[PDB]
Amino acid sequence: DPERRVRSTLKKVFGFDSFKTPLQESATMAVVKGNKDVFVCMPTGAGKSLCYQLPALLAKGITIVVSPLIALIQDQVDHLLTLKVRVSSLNSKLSAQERKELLADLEREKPQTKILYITPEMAASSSFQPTLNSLVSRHLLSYLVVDEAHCVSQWGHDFRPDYLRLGALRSRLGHAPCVALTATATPQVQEDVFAALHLKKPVAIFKTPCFRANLFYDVQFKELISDPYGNLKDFCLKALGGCGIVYCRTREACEQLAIELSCRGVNAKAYHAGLKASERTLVQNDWMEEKVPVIVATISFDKANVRFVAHWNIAKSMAGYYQESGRAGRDGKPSWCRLYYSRNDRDQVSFLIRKEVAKLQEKRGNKASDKATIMAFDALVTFCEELGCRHAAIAKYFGDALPACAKGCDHCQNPTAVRRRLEALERSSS
Ligand SMILES: Nc1ncnc2c1ncn2[C@@H]1O[C@H](COP(=O)(O)OP(=O)(O)O)[C@@H](O)[C@H]1O
Ligand SMILES: [Mg+2]
Ligand SMILES: [Zn+2]
């Protein structure tokens, strides 16, 4: 009865009566089985570390975990140690005796070390190769875990050439299943992970869908609104009856909107990097304690009663838009997400990204991530100019199945209304 073995370890070691979600449960059970290569794709804070930390304790041998930096490794090592777990870390920070003590333990016929954290540079080093081959030869390797697996991809936010060497390492240890985990949900990133880590097919996939049922999405065209500040004021008031957010691009527009909304009868405090750090925490504290309902911001600081998120200007990427609008309705109660779109604002953001790209190119030459940045923006322009379900467009971008939008977006609420606003936009060009 492995379910019972898992359930007892969950309580006695990790001190938990249940799994956070059933997907965390299915993922953990699939890693325990040990018959296939596993891919875990869940949001940050969804309990991905347990999906591999728990099975490692129930396996006969050692689990090797690859992670990008020592700072993040140390946090994971310090955490497991308090649970009285036999966790170790082979890195550059180790003193002469420390490394000698750890290398000796691994050379024992029955080593004490159950979980070993290493950086990719260390995994692929010729000096680590005698240790690894001995473990493979003695059938002492139970799992190979690749955390932050999106690091293999130039289509992700954190490309690391060191992660590309991990494919050849994985190929050398066939007996041991491989576990790959990330929060990045795009299909190109998933495809890069499967190919770069030389994963064995069929891969067991545990993917949290990006769909958020309680969010009402709409797109309004600033060009066709006689009183723009009046529309934002209406939207802000109607959504309440908690708190709400308004995003904009400039410090100028951030100040204009904060004063402009306070005049209409909706108390708004401007938040940007131009202000003093003393004032930053002050404005933050007041929005958190509901003294001020609206925060107009260009930058960010997690409030649970966010009833609205309004984007005064188009965001820089589809992933950025998903994350910023995603700050709404964390309590599960109904919330509203509006993106105010104009072709001039599109031309402005596009120009800004192209300069930022040329600045990186002047600094370090050409890279394949240069094209990804333009495509991440053009996917958001497509969403703004598209006629279709707002939730189905997000699902398609993140490789999810069609979501059950029960009149949960402007297009689904009334497709004719979205069509008339779009026709007026297309005609205005002539
Ligand atoms: N079954 C569980 N029940 C409750 N909390 C859990 C459970 N499993 C893990 N957690 C906790 O969830 C938090 C976030 O998990 P973590 O592994 O850091 O997530 P991720 O890698 O997805 O960002 C941690 O503080 C962890 O202890
Ligand atoms: Mg993690
Ligand atoms: Zn819809």
Side-chain angles (χ1 to χ4, degrees), residues 1-11 13-59 61-92 94-109 111-232 234-265 267-275 277-290 292-301 303-370 372-430:
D1 187 11
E3 303 92 58
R4 188 171 166 190
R5 273 186 79 207
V6 160
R7 205 84 67 174
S8 65
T9 310
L10 183 71
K11 190 68 198 162
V13 192
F14 301 99
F16 304 126
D17 280 273
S18 66
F19 284 108
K20 218 158 170 158
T21 63
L23 191 61
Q24 194 205 30
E25 180 184 332
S26 298
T28 301
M29 290 318 297
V31 176
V32 165
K33 211 175 176 172
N35 56 325
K36 29 184 75 192
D37 275 8
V38 187
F39 175 69
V40 181
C41 175
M42 305 178 160
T44 306
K48 288 188 294 288
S49 312
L50 194 117
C51 295
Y52 68 86
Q53 284 170 345
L54 193 154
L57 307 181
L58 298 158
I62 316 175
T63 291
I64 306 189
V65 188
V66 181
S67 203
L69 311 141
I70 326 165
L72 193 73
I73 282 167
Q74 204 58 261
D75 302 334
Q76 294 270 62
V77 172
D78 298 357
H79 184 268
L80 282 160
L81 277 165
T82 69
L83 302 165
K84 304 165 184 180
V85 173
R86 274 178 182 92
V87 69
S88 305
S89 185
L90 183 65
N91 51 54
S92 72
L94 291 179
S95 75
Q97 184 73 346
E98 271 164 15
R99 195 181 260 94
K100 197 196 173 185
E101 230 129 82
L102 173 58
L103 282 158
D105 180 84
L106 295 165
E107 284 316 313
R108 236 172 278 174
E109 31 281 297
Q112 277 189 54
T113 289
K114 217 78 208 128
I115 302 162
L116 176 69
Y117 281 87
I118 58 171
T119 50
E121 44 272 29
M122 262 255 38
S125 72
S126 63
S127 52
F128 175 72
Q129 297 327 305
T131 307
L132 197 77
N133 283 279
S134 187
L135 293 155
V136 171
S137 302
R138 293 185 286 163
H139 319 76
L140 256 53
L141 247 167
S142 288
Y143 299 105
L144 167 70
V145 176
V146 183
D147 204 4
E148 300 292 88
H150 57 272
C151 292
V152 301
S153 186
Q154 293 229 49
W155 293 83
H157 82 279
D158 199 347
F159 182 69
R160 286 169 190 274
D162 279 345
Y163 263 67
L164 285 158
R165 282 271 160 79
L166 306 174
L169 192 95
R170 154 78 191 137
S171 279
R172 285 163 61 235
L173 15 147
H175 59 281
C178 184
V179 186
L181 315 90
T182 188
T184 312
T186 60
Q188 194 53 248
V189 162
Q190 190 182 302
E191 280 155 27
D192 283 0
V193 164
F194 290 22
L197 302 183
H198 299 190
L199 304 189
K200 305 212 218 87
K201 325 275 160 129
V203 182
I205 303 159
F206 298 93
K207 177 174 178 50
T208 312
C210 285
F211 180 54
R212 281 193 55 195
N214 66 308
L215 295 187
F216 190 88
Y217 280 96
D218 81 317
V219 185
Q220 294 297 310
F221 311 112
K222 285 147 79 91
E223 300 121 307
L224 313 170
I225 301 163
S226 53
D227 184 20
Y229 299 108
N231 198 278
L232 187 68
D234 283 22
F235 179 83
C236 293
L237 295 154
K238 193 184 172 180
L240 302 160
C243 72
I245 319 152
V246 171
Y247 288 106
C248 62
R249 179 179 63 86
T250 66
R251 293 176 183 184
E252 294 103 298
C254 188
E255 281 292 353
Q256 173 84 295
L257 291 157
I259 304 156
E260 229 299 326
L261 289 158
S262 276
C263 277
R264 310 304 278 250
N267 193 49
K269 244 278 166 73
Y271 187 88
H272 61 86
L275 308 155
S278 324
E279 216 177 301
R280 234 100 70 89
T281 324
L282 188 83
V283 182
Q284 185 174 11
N285 284 205
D286 267 68
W287 183 75
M288 294 285 193
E289 302 312 314
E290 279 142 283
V292 183
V294 185
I295 190 152
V296 189
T298 63
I299 55 161
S300 62
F301 307 134
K303 199 119 181 71
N305 59 323
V306 176
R307 295 274 68 73
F308 76 80
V309 173
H311 275 77
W312 187 247
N313 309 114
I314 184 167
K316 298 176 82 190
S317 71
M318 176 64 68
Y321 183 62
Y322 176 85
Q323 185 201 209
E324 299 156 19
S325 65
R327 280 175 225 262
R330 295 274 181 86
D331 54 13
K333 285 180 169 74
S335 311
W336 285 263
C337 299
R338 182 174 289 180
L339 204 174
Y340 287 99
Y341 178 77
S342 80
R343 271 144 180 195
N344 162 101
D345 271 15
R346 173 206 61 199
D347 290 343
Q348 211 63 246
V349 178
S350 179
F351 168 63
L352 208 112
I353 299 162
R354 287 158 200 284
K355 281 207 249 179
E356 285 189 294
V357 166
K359 244 84 165 72
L360 285 171
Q361 282 172 334
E362 140 232 74
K363 174 170 153 282
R364 47 77 170 144
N366 301 302
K367 307 288 165 187
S369 59
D370 301 335
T373 313
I374 308 321
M375 294 173 76
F377 180 62
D378 294 347
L380 183 56
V381 171
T382 293
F383 169 100
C384 286
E385 271 169 24
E386 228 185 63
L387 224 134
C389 175
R390 304 305 180 183
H391 301 270
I394 290 162
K396 192 186 166 73
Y397 188 78
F398 293 117
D400 291 327
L402 195 88
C405 195
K407 288 177 166 282
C409 80
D410 60 4
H411 173 267
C412 288
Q413 190 189 68
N414 180 0
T416 328
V418 178
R419 203 188 289 267
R420 301 284 164 85
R421 295 196 305 252
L422 208 66
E423 279 172 337
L425 176 88
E426 260 288 280
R427 219 174 293 111
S428 67
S429 321
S430 182

